[model samples]
Target: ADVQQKLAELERQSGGRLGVALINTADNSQILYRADERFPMCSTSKVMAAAAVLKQSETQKQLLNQPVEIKPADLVNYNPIAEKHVNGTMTLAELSAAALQYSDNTAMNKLIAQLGGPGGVTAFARAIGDETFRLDRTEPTLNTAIPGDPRDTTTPRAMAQTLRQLTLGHALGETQRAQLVTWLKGNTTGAASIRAGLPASWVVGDKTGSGGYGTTNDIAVIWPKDRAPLILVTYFTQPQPKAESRRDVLASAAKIVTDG
Candidate 1:
């Protein structure tokens, strides 16, 4: 009840709806603050896209280090600097790493193309038993856009399920799971919320997505001392005056979950 009251107060303060879902990965027990609610995932969709690529690699027999060129035309407003530096050449691993670490739109689009189109990502979500997950339509102006769809769509429940699966080594094989965790651990985006809320000693793997129109979301796995891994997914939309306000809300919520 106290948590609910706090969440209600935050919603009123931020003038943005918020949803959260948390799960204890070790025993699969969940404590959902707002699990069924849906929101735009923004770049968080990259996780699904990344998972699809890794899954494809399992059967396609492609080397992660194989060279793939990032042409100037492909840049198309994704990341001008990354495109210029590539000069149209980089390994698949490099591109994927850039996408996950820096949230590079160009890198993510290229990786999605390599993963066999957006359907492949949807297929991956379905395979993982999440029917509500779908990629957002891409907009030319919006770096993270995906055609006609919203940035991306997901429920707190589905996001939590995805993270839980990844952490439990069920979404990908041993090697792929390890690689995915490593990539998430190295994520540089959304650090202010999940990573900043936990103790310095606790290791966290997460991905964050924020947009110009006031959307902030994070999906994370917190590894606590002598406790099972905790999966936390928080989404906020239509933020207040500034991004920091929304971030503070998420950070406070994260602290509550971690300390609880």
Candidate 2:
């Protein structure tokens, strides 16, 4: 199936809305599915948060090895930190890996704080030209929001734009941006999305986000065989949802675009 057919399968029926953006990195061609619809970004915001830190690091020339800690007051809901019940000093680099690679919520809690809270992260995103992306508060807050509480939200187009800016080295210098790509390539969290959809031998870099109101999303840079990479962003949402199917769509979606 082409990406359009796969996307058709992912859309409104019995399922929550699926907002998608597919960009061909080689020639800058793009496909946007409900490109204007904004879904709760959830932990996908961490990618911006990590970039916020790295952008500063570029000017400061500071390394991620800087010592960091999460206090009792800092604890927030969700993921491995709560599961393992552990929080102590870890290098900023280590914390970043936890946030990016594992999608660890508590690690993001600290990273968001380090970026000087949601406002800081938002500012960094805007400075880099991601006008539509918003981060009003940290995680767990992502899990629940009183109406009009400034929920973190973004459109598939804006997200693809963000990924393009990062990959094209618009935000970070070449080496700095490449380093972020390396960390993202290490992402272990959203295996079922684009990575799972592509050829097993193929490699890609991605970040996955999930939370309340049934948000399941993954944004990726697909490195197709001997071809320039493509950016594939898929978001599956409903007030509630059933078992996995978007992953299957994403797999088909990859085949669609690559074949096209």
Candidate 3:
């Protein structure tokens, strides 16, 4: 298909490694490009963090409302939202939203703590049958994006499939699932990625991540007007130091995958 050629050109122009995995829920149709390669997950891991929190809230409904104390020490770089709540407390649901919608570093670490650290979210992904997903270390550190190091990485295919299980499959309860979708839909940081490439009429909820070495990512669940829904993951990273993070490449990839 021409999309394959177009996506290649997009990758070339990006001057980075670009991986895409798109799944059409209507018929399980797919479009893939280097979909199996591992890429730094960056803040996109917040989606899983939030989902794990919601999964626990499933058994104990009160968990969502439970307040989590936020000390000054919990704050980290790039944490504008969490800074306000320092020395205060935010409920699990609030923290989850802060992480997903704002990609707040402190909120992510706090949620990770609630899950017992990076391994806990990895266990959650594994429980959902996503063996290719693994998260090690916390914010800022995880964003190191060192080439060839598999830590804090996931394949595009695994990210898309795991999102499928969480949003469209049975992994999350209906109410909790809806909550997750809402948080993604409200995401403030994904504007230039998948969301920008798609038509305005097609509703989309996505999480975006950024890090060193041009690493940037966006994973989303899209709602076409007449179809079930689609799950898409786009991950990109350049090996060069201080390389440009081309979100436009993500937009172009989304267009190539969904336009035809």
Candidate 4:
């Protein structure tokens, strides 16, 4: 069966909408299912925010090493890593790890501030040739996940392309790219999603996000044993009244895309 048929079956079973894109970086082959449709980015945009920081650091020289203080007032809900460092200072690399690895909202907010706000993140994507990745609001507000609204949303294919450019292309300097990959590979939050679909021998680095309207997302760089890397992006959203976001749906989608 084609990839789309398998994904459609899963979508029907879950009673939700799905946007997917899988890219074999080796051959540049692709499998897309509604990959152009917009879905709330939730915290998944943190990766782009982190990438933007690294891209800027290329020219700023001291950007990544500079410390940014985290105030109690700057904290937000669901910020596990940020809570541990309140009233302390963290470098941009540390904050990127907190946000991308742990989905720390406060960490993401701080990163966004470094870029001059959500617009900065959006500009970074545009500069990188991604037209569909946009961030119009900061966290908590961005997580509102309003149906039909385009704010704070990205298409799955655009995300995959951006990840390809950032991870496998020359979007970031060599050292910065390695640092970003390290942070993503150490991510602790995606055990149930894309990572779950893979075998023990394969490697994956990913960032996850959840929001209102049953939105849950994961965009990953997967390295199957003895093969070239692949970029896979999966975004799921159900219409309001919202249903619970299911990580298993993402796993199933991953399996469908990567099934051998």
Query: Which candidate comes out best when scored by TM-score?
Result: 3
Better of 2 and 3 by lDDT: 3
TM-score of each: 0.88, 0.88, 0.98, 0.97
lDDT of 2 at 231: 84
Per-residue error at 151 for model 3, in Å? 0.5
lDDT of 4 by residue, 1-260 (tens): 57778888999998789889999977899999998889888988999999999988899998888898988998888889888788998899888889998899999999999999999999999999998988999877888887899999989989999998898888888988998888889999998999888887999999999999888899999999988999999999888756898899999999998885
lDDT of 2 by residue, 1-260 (tens): 36666667646353657777888877889887778877778778889989888887787776687877666565666556434435557667877888889887888877888888998998998999989998987777774422223578888999998888887656888877988899999998767777777777667899987765566778887777778888878866665433433455555555655666
Residues 149-254, model 3: lDDT tens digits: 9999999999999999888888999998899999998989888999889998999899999899989899999998787899999999998869878898899889
Compared with the true structure, all predictions reach lDDT values of 0.73, 0.75, 0.91, 0.90
Ranking by lDDT: 3, 4, 2, 1
CA displacement after TM-score superposition, residue 5 of candidate 3 (Å): 1.1
Residue 223 miss distance in model 1 (angstroms)? 0.8
In model 2, which regions exceed 4 Å deviation? Answer: 1-6, 79-87, 145-150, 241-246
TM-score winner between candidates 1 and 3: 3
**Candidates 1 and 4, the one with greater lDDT:** 4
Evaluate residue 200 in candidate 3 and report its C-alpha lDDT on the 0 to 100 scale: 83
The global Cα lDDT (0 to 1) of model 2 is 0.75
Better of 3 and 4 by lDDT: 3
Flag clash pairs in model 2. 197-251
TM-score of 1: 0.88
- Backbone clash pairs for candidate 4 read none
